[PDB]
Amino acid sequence: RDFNNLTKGLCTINSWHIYGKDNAVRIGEDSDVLVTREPYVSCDPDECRFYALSQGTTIRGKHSNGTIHDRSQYRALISWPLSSPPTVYNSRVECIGWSSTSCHDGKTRMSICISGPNNNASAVIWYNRRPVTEINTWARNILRTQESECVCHNGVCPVVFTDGSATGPAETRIYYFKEGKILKWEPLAGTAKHIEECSCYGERAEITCTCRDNWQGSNRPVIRIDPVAMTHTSQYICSPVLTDNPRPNDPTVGKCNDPYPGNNNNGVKGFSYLDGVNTWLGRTISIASRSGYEMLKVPNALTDDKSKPTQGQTIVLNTDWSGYSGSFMDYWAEGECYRACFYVELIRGRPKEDKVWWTSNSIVSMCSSTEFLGQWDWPDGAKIEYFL
Amino acid sequence: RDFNNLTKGLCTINSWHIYGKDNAVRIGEDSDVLVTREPYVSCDPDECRFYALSQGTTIRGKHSNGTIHDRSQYRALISWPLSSPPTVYNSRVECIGWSSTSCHDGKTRMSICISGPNNNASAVIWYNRRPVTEINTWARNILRTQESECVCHNGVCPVVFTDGSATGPAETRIYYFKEGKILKWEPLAGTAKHIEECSCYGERAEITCTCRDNWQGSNRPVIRIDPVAMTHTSQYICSPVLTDNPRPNDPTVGKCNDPYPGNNNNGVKGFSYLDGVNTWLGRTISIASRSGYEMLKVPNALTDDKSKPTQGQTIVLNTDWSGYSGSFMDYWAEGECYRACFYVELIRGRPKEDKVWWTSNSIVSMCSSTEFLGQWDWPDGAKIEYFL
Amino acid sequence: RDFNNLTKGLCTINSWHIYGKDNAVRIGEDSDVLVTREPYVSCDPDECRFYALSQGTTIRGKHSNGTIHDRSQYRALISWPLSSPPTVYNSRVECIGWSSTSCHDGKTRMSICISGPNNNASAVIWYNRRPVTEINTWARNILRTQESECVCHNGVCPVVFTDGSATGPAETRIYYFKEGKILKWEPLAGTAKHIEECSCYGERAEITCTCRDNWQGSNRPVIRIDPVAMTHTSQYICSPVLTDNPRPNDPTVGKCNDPYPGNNNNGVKGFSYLDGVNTWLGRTISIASRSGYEMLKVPNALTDDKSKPTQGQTIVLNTDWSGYSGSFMDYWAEGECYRACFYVELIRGRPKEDKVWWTSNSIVSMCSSTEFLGQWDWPDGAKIEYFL
Amino acid sequence: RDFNNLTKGLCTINSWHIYGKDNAVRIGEDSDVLVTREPYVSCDPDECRFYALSQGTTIRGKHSNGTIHDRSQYRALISWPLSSPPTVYNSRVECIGWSSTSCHDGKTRMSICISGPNNNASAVIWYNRRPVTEINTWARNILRTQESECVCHNGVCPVVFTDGSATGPAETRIYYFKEGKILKWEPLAGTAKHIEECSCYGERAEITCTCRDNWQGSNRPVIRIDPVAMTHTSQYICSPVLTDNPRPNDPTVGKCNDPYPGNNNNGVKGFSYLDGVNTWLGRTISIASRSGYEMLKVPNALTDDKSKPTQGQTIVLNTDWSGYSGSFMDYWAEGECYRACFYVELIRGRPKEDKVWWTSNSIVSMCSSTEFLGQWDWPDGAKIEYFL
Numbered sequence A, B, C, D: 001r002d003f004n005n006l007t008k009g010l011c012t013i014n015s016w017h018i019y020g021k022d023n024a025v026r027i028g029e030d031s032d033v034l035v036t037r038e039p040y041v042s043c044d045p046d047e048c049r050f051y052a053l054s055q056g057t058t059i060r061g062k063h064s065n066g067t068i069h070d071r072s073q074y075r076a077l078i079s080w081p082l083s084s085p086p087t088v089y090n091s092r093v094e095c096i097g098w099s100s101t102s103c104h105d106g107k108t109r110m111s112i113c114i115s116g117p118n119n120n121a122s123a124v125i126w127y128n129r130r131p132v133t134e135i136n137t138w139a140r141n142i143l144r145t146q147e148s149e150c151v152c153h154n155g156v157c158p159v160v161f162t163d164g165s166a167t168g169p170a171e172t173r174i175y176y177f178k179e180g181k182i183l184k185w186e187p188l189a190g191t192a193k194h195i196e197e198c199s200c201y202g203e204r205a206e207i208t209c210t211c212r213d214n215w216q217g218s219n220r221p222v223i224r225i226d227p228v229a230m231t232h233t234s235q236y237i238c239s240p241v242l243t244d245n246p247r248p249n250d251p252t253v254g255k256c257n258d259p260y261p262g263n264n265n266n267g268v269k270g271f272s273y274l275d276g277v278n279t280w281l282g283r284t285i286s287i288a289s290r291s292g293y294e295m296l297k298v299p300n301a302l303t304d305d306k307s308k309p310t311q312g313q314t315i316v317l318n319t320d321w322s323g324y325s326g327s328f329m330d331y332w333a334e335g336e337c338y339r340a341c342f343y344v345e346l347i348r349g350r351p352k353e354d355k356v357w358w359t360s361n362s363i364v365s366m367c368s369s370t371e372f373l374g375q376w377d378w379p380d381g382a383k384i385e386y387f388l
């Protein structure tokens, strides 16, 4: 109908309720489920669906051998019905590639997939399921993007891309698209020193993205975008509650405009909701590996370099595998506010479970509740031994 | 369009005709059919579908081992096309959880799923396929609900919940929802001493629910709800024709306001249609186990403590496994009356058939006919030996 | 929109072109294809689909053992997309039973399924995918119907049923339905001595049905129905070109009002298009078994007791298995005439191929052309040895 | 709505971006994927889909043995969602046959399938998913058509057919269809000496088809059609950059009105975009076999007998199997120009890989970009050894 506008603020997050779970790895042990990774969730005005990068083979298939690898010509962004697993028969291909983002602007959906060799990748921007614009690699070193949904406001859908080193300065750009066409792009500004895989959401005409500083930061960089002025700023979450992984132990004071040191050249896609006292941070429980997952209420985390938790909720036990996590919201729901949601990728197989030759995942997803709900843990649930 | 109103009375039940059957266990021996239990049927204005709690694995899958268990993080309420089996590829997830109810109000559908550990469960109420309201456990002891469809009248859809002991007094509440929001709730009143898994239907602006007194009753408790006044009453079916299971043999006089003694701490979800002489009771043939199933016409069963059968119809032979049963009707059919329908869950596997490591079921469903139709029996039809 | 009226006459049949083929048995050797038999084809105003009686198991499934049997509680009328095979995932259940018919009246579809034990069967008539009317067995001996589509005119859809002996006089009735309700029924009249499985079509406000005289006739009985007056007549095809099976060799003169003798208590569902010189008869090539299939142009076959072929077309070689055949037409196609079509059931497995424990089939379907097209043969195509 | 008119010219082709890829053979190693060959892509106003000739069996199925054969009664034109593989459950049958073409005229789709024995084949023309016209073989020697989409202009959809020898003069006809009916047909004219499998596209009210001269030409014949006047011309691509296969090495000067000699009685379906300097030719890299695939910009290739490449892009490495290739465009996309697209059939199995008993393929597809995008190679990706 009309372009969606970010007119509401976030609902008060007092806890998290279960939203979706596909149990993909459990089910795929004996059904035609595609091997995936880098999943996310994204809503259309009349439907919310799961998204991921397929590896172009089923989990039980012999071609599952080697799926720990990230970029092959057999990957594609696929989407499928909420909480169903990504099967050969119910998965819809949005575009071909090994890095992606996607979002609905209220009228139709824009999907972006990047493909190609490391030194010659290109992004193809799809709108209304048709290819509209293409962008060639500018730094010739793995052009890559969010791996979770973008956000739109009055037709303008900003997207964060990075091209260049994963272990030193890179070239990050913020592109402002409208109907799949480039309105404007700008180089990253602010104090964030390295940017990868931004997790974004919008409220009251502003888009907030929590990203990954792969190079040096154990705290997470934050990009705030004005989609009307088509400008942005960047900084780090000030709070000493560190949310990347691996990471050093939590200090008593964090860093606002520089990466918090201790771990270099590594990380994990993550997210946060930065809204004053209504601030919640997600993170793996383990500081060493993609193990466990918890939500922590950290009032003013973004601006308070001494902020610590006041409430929390465990999502995945430290005795279970987690992985990527990101933000999304149903911008077309009823009510006076946007209900914060997130998903956690539950990685199974390599490298942590190397008795199998594949690497895949399942998805668990939650949204906020104004109630103070009891908590449960949500593991992938598959028994690797069954696959041996 | 407009909210449905219960303006018609029940059609005269002179017999039962076959409505649906999915032969899920037979088919799933060699196709990707999900393991389920606690099924039911529910209609939308333009379609009627089967519903159940998936176990998040196929029957032939190795993860089917252990599906006798009731509450895991891998369960979800799913729905699929009438008489088709619940497959990985045709099952639509309504919400995540291990106890549920669902009903269409004429405009859209409300679905409720409860999840969590025994002492910290929560219900999430979905409306128009979006999460709208959440309710935390109030007694911290397996918050649970109907396991069959709810019923709506002018937008108000009452739902019966129980939290607390299964072997002593518990805390039952009747929630009145409208568009997924809580209008009102009240604690159970009347003479019913324990309430679980209510099976409901509506006619002439009144909703009748036949439930399960797990604690002490072999006769079934009944809750009658006024969805306009949002009030209710409760009692037991007076008739000496006992319908829970296990149960003692039938006496010559029943109990109207107290559980009929003989069997404690056990039961099975069941149902009835209480309409004067047009009263029909469903029950397992066996008084000891979930074996066989029959419909018995027992005029004034609800109010006559000496009422006995005047007609009957066998649905499943005592030599075949049955299980849960419940009520539903197509409130959007043509005609001057609502045609009473019901389903019977045909449980296969554990605990009765322990040569296999799983527990699942198939569904058989019937609706009333004004004719006096010949009867047939309707077994699950699978050969367990094939699964060995 | 509006009820369809049989306002056109048949197009001139100069040959037959391939319309549909599902290769179900070939494909099902390695995919989840349901075991079926008694198939047919039927059109809706916007789609034509394949129909059949499922056996409630896949062909490769262990429950395929024994599917030679006709009436079990695991059968159902299913429909699926034209030329696709009937799979677990794409088959839509129309109703439960082991004998059926179905037809669209222009507004919506009526489907009829009969189920039950031999002495207590009942038909349930569905309209707009809801059960509307039920008819109890009147002769208590396998109530049964067409096994191919019915035909409608201004809302009135006549259907031929038989109840009673398959080897002596039986009780045949013609029911006139409108919106699933019974307008009228009448007992069979005319000279046809036994009636089973009528294959019907309509043109110029008249419905012609070619049926099966199981008791004594090797020539086929014919019922012509006036759906406005709701009356009919019956006789036999006069032509000496005999079309039932098994049957004696062709004589030089046939019988118009009595069964042509030579073979008793057996037959096969078949069809014909009786339109003056534009008359075409279908039949198995073998006079002994359901082997091969051919179309023969026999001018005035219905009324000329000496009529012989003037043209022909082979559909299935005598070295290949055939089976049931029946008529259907797309009453909603463009043009000035109705294009005659038919399907042939290609039975595989028992009893002819007993190395396998199952019985199933695939479908081949043709429609007429005003051209004189070259002919090909259309076998099922599966290799039984592959199933061993 | 209204018939589509070819009102736009081609967009400037500066490179090719990835459009679709189904990885069918990889996925089908462990899922129910149909064996196919002769694929293509074609758009409807609201969707673009993959098309191919199924072999009526899955790849893992035992009936895959022998699928190197071209014309059996088990083949059919099927279509399925873009970039999904052709599975038993998602493939829609358009018609039955072993040679086809299909195209949308803006209102609805016309599909054509030819079937029958070599000396008695016939084409059936479907419109709006209904059979409308039939054409009998005129030369009684494998009536055959494009194997890629046709193109329409104001309702007129020309189609090129050939009947007769593959190794000497044959009888080629251009049929002009409108709503599935024959408006006119004409015999091939011009200097093209043999015509097979034309690959066509339209722009500015003209349809250009690049075909295959199986008899003698290593350069490709070209048919240009005026769909309004319903007339055409034919010639050969003048350029010395030869594009059929097998073929002799590239000379310095080609032939404009005669086949370039060196290879007889063989070839491969191919295509080109002939638009002045914006001219791009597709071809296998190998001159001996269907190995590799590249796009070459050859300004004025059609008219310049000395034209050589000025730019290029590799699509499939010479170390990987290719096969058929053809043109298609989304005539309903936004913008001021038509974006040239093509697909390449990646054949796997026999005859090149004879360790397996089958022959199948997967699809890769690209469209043009006005950018100068980095290139990647796109192999089928399956490991034959896995199928052993």
Ligand SMILES: *[C@@H]1O[C@H](CO)[C@@H](O[C@@H]2O[C@H](CO)[C@@H](O[C@@H]3O[C@H](CO[C@H]4O[C@H](CO)[C@@H](O)[C@H](O)[C@@H]4O)[C@@H](O)[C@H](O[C@H]4O[C@H](CO)[C@@H](O)[C@H](O)[C@@H]4O[C@H]4O[C@H](CO)[C@@H](O)[C@H](O)[C@@H]4O[C@H]4O[C@H](CO)[C@@H](O)[C@H](O)[C@@H]4O)[C@@H]3O)[C@H](O)[C@H]2NC(C)=O)[C@H](O)[C@H]1NC(C)=O
Pocket: A240, A241, A242, A248, A249, A250, A251, A285, A286, A287, A294, A295, A296, A308, A309, A310, A311, A312, A313, A372, A373, A374, A375, B119, B120
């Ligand atoms: C039924 O359900 C309800 C609803 O969920 C359950 O109630 C919930 O219970 C939760 C567990 O107790 C609780 O979550 C905790 O909340 C704490 C905050 O609340 C407390 O502090 C405030 C502040 O003054 C008070 O107002 C409040 O009353 C409480 O006292 C958090 O601080 C907790 O998080 C910390 O602990 C967990 C371990 O439990 C860690 O995993 C987590 O990361 C936090 O601790 C680390 O980080 C801090 C910050 O830097 C450090 O100070 C600390 O040392 C830890 O650091 C190590 O570990 C991290 C992670 O590995 C590593 O990076 C670092 O380097 C160090 O090694 C926790 O979030 C919910 O708030 C509560 N909800 C409600 C509504 O009450 C109820 O129990 C359930 N019922 C039953 C019967 O089970």
Ligand SMILES: *[C@@H]1O[C@H](CO)[C@@H](O[C@@H]2O[C@H](CO)[C@@H](O[C@@H]3O[C@H](CO[C@H]4O[C@H](CO)[C@@H](O)[C@H](O)[C@@H]4O)[C@@H](O)[C@H](O[C@H]4O[C@H](CO)[C@@H](O)[C@H](O)[C@@H]4O[C@H]4O[C@H](CO)[C@@H](O)[C@H](O)[C@@H]4O[C@H]4O[C@H](CO)[C@@H](O)[C@H](O)[C@@H]4O)[C@@H]3O)[C@H](O)[C@H]2NC(C)=O)[C@H](O)[C@H]1NC(C)=O
Pocket: B240, B241, B242, B248, B249, B250, B251, B285, B286, B287, B294, B295, B296, B308, B309, B310, B311, B312, B313, B372, B373, B374, B375, C119, C120
């Ligand atoms: C073709 O199809 C038609 C249509 O279905 C077939 O006709 C049907 O036939 C059915 C079987 O005969 C019949 O069903 C029975 O109806 C009886 C009621 O009708 C009779 O009584 C009235 C009352 O005066 C008369 O008007 C009427 O004319 C009849 O005489 C029921 O009473 C029957 O139910 C009881 O029996 C069955 C066993 O058959 C039990 O399973 C059932 O639970 C009932 O009996 C138990 O319960 C009562 C009540 O407390 C006790 O008194 C009794 O002792 C039993 O108790 C034991 O068992 C239970 C269950 O295990 C346990 O809990 C308890 O503790 C005790 O151990 C039965 O329902 C249909 O009405 C009839 N329909 C029609 C339209 O005619 C026809 O036969 C078919 N044709 C062929 C050729 O097959």
Ligand SMILES: *[C@@H]1O[C@H](CO)[C@@H](O[C@@H]2O[C@H](CO)[C@@H](O[C@@H]3O[C@H](CO[C@H]4O[C@H](CO)[C@@H](O)[C@H](O)[C@@H]4O)[C@@H](O)[C@H](O[C@H]4O[C@H](CO)[C@@H](O)[C@H](O)[C@@H]4O[C@H]4O[C@H](CO)[C@@H](O)[C@H](O)[C@@H]4O[C@H]4O[C@H](CO)[C@@H](O)[C@H](O)[C@@H]4O)[C@@H]3O)[C@H](O)[C@H]2NC(C)=O)[C@H](O)[C@H]1NC(C)=O
Pocket: C240, C241, C242, C248, C249, C250, C251, C285, C286, C287, C294, C295, C296, C308, C309, C310, C311, C312, C313, C372, C373, C374, C375, D119, D120
């Ligand atoms: C390319 O394609 C075209 C298009 O299809 C091919 O041309 C077609 O060729 C067909 C085969 O020749 C032909 O079909 C035959 O037509 C005959 C009728 O035409 C002839 O007679 C008339 C009458 O005067 C002439 O006008 C006309 O010119 C012809 O001469 C039919 O009579 C044929 O059917 C009979 O033969 C077949 C065997 O081929 C039987 O299976 C069939 O049942 C018919 O014969 C039985 O029945 C009759 C009637 O009672 C008996 O008299 C006879 O003895 C047989 O009885 C035995 O067998 C039956 C069945 O088993 C059993 O029940 C009984 O008891 C006995 O045992 C046949 O239909 C098409 O018309 C023709 N089409 C066109 C447009 O030309 C062309 O060949 C192809 N090209 C190539 C190169 O292959």
Ligand SMILES: *[C@@H]1O[C@H](CO)[C@@H](O[C@@H]2O[C@H](CO)[C@@H](O[C@@H]3O[C@H](CO[C@H]4O[C@H](CO)[C@@H](O)[C@H](O)[C@@H]4O)[C@@H](O)[C@H](O[C@H]4O[C@H](CO)[C@@H](O)[C@H](O)[C@@H]4O[C@H]4O[C@H](CO)[C@@H](O)[C@H](O)[C@@H]4O[C@H]4O[C@H](CO)[C@@H](O)[C@H](O)[C@@H]4O)[C@@H]3O)[C@H](O)[C@H]2NC(C)=O)[C@H](O)[C@H]1NC(C)=O
Pocket: A119, A120, D240, D241, D242, D248, D249, D250, D251, D285, D286, D287, D294, D295, D296, D308, D309, D310, D311, D312, D313, D372, D373, D374, D375
């Ligand atoms: C990142 O991505 C970009 C974008 O893709 C990459 O840049 C691309 O690089 C490509 C490879 O270098 C390049 O493709 C080539 O372009 C040549 C044309 O450009 C050149 O010539 C013009 C003309 O004066 C100049 O303006 C221009 O500056 C260049 O110098 C083509 O000629 C090339 O094709 C020929 O070579 C390939 C082998 O590489 C053959 O496979 C192909 O068939 C062509 O050669 C055959 O045919 C000709 C014509 O008859 C014969 O003369 C020749 O001998 C060959 O004949 C043999 O082989 C054929 C085929 O087997 C056989 O039939 C025959 O009989 C003989 O045996 C080639 O197309 C892109 O244009 C370029 N794109 C851009 C935008 O720059 C960049 O490299 C990537 N970056 C990295 C770091 O990898």
Ligand SMILES: *[C@@H]1O[C@H](CO)[C@@H](O[C@@H]2O[C@H](CO)[C@@H](O)[C@H](O)[C@H]2NC(C)=O)[C@H](O)[C@H]1NC(C)=O
Pocket: A002, A003, A004, A005, A154
């Ligand atoms: C989001 O905000 C913009 C207003 O800036 C709205 O876009 C007006 O919408 C109407 C209805 O289609 C048009 O007549 C105006 O020209 C629109 N655009 C502008 C840029 O002024 C848009 O309607 C809002 N979205 C929603 C859902 O209300």
Ligand SMILES: *[C@@H]1O[C@H](CO)[C@@H](O[C@@H]2O[C@H](CO)[C@@H](O)[C@H](O)[C@H]2NC(C)=O)[C@H](O)[C@H]1NC(C)=O
Pocket: C002, C003, C004, C005, C154
């Ligand atoms: C089939 O024939 C009957 C006419 O007997 C048509 O039914 C008239 O249709 C209009 C349009 O809905 C109504 O106003 C009349 O009352 C209809 N019925 C009768 C019984 O008179 C019907 O329209 C015809 N079907 C088609 C497709 O034309």
Ligand SMILES: CC(=O)N[C@H]1[C@H]([C@H](O)[C@H](O)CO)OC(C(=O)O)=C[C@@H]1N
Pocket: A038, A070, A071, A098, A099, A142, A143, A144, A165, A166, A196, A197, A214, A267, A268
């Ligand atoms: C485009 C690409 O390959 N992205 C990969 C990502 C990057 O390798 C990482 O962010 C460093 O640049 O890492 C991870 C990862 O699991 O850490 C997965 C992504 N597939």
Ligand SMILES: CC(=O)N[C@H]1[C@H]([C@H](O)[C@H](O)CO)OC(C(=O)O)=C[C@@H]1N
Pocket: B038, B070, B071, B098, B099, B142, B143, B144, B165, B166, B196, B197, B214, B267, B268
């Ligand atoms: C929420 C829950 O676990 N409900 C279970 C139910 C209860 O255990 C029973 O009603 C006693 O409370 O029993 C049964 C049962 O088969 O008896 C199945 C239900 N899964």
Ligand SMILES: CC(=O)N[C@H]1[C@H]([C@H](O)[C@H](O)CO)OC(C(=O)O)=C[C@@H]1N
Pocket: C038, C070, C071, C098, C099, C142, C143, C144, C165, C166, C196, C197, C214, C267, C268
């Ligand atoms: C209802 C029923 O069982 N109909 C069967 C039919 C009858 O047995 C036959 O027409 C005699 O009555 O025969 C055949 C048959 O193959 O001859 C199949 C049908 N399933």
Ligand SMILES: CC(=O)N[C@H]1[C@H]([C@H](O)[C@H](O)CO)OC(C(=O)O)=C[C@@H]1N
Pocket: D038, D070, D071, D098, D099, D142, D143, D144, D165, D166, D196, D197, D214, D267, D268
């Ligand atoms: C109708 C038909 O059989 N067409 C076939 C085609 C022809 O054999 C070829 O064009 C020569 O006529 O060749 C090829 C081929 O791979 O070369 C495939 C087609 N199936």
Ligand SMILES: *[C@@H]1O[C@H](CO)[C@@H](O)[C@H](O)[C@H]1NC(C)=O
Pocket: C065, C066, C357
């Ligand atoms: C099929 O069933 C028969 C009868 O029960 C049995 O003797 C036979 O061995 C079975 N065949 C298979 C393959 O199970």
Ligand SMILES: [Ca+2]
Pocket: A212, A213, A214, A215, A216, A217, A218, A244, A245, A263, A265, A266, A267, A268
């Ligand atoms: Ca980091």
Ligand SMILES: [Ca+2]
Pocket: none
């Ligand atoms: Ca399988």
Ligand SMILES: [Ca+2]
Pocket: B212, B213, B214, B215, B216, B217, B218, B244, B245, B263, B265, B266, B267, B268
């Ligand atoms: Ca009880």
Ligand SMILES: [Ca+2]
Pocket: C212, C213, C214, C215, C216, C217, C218, C244, C245, C263, C265, C266, C267, C268
């Ligand atoms: Ca007979």
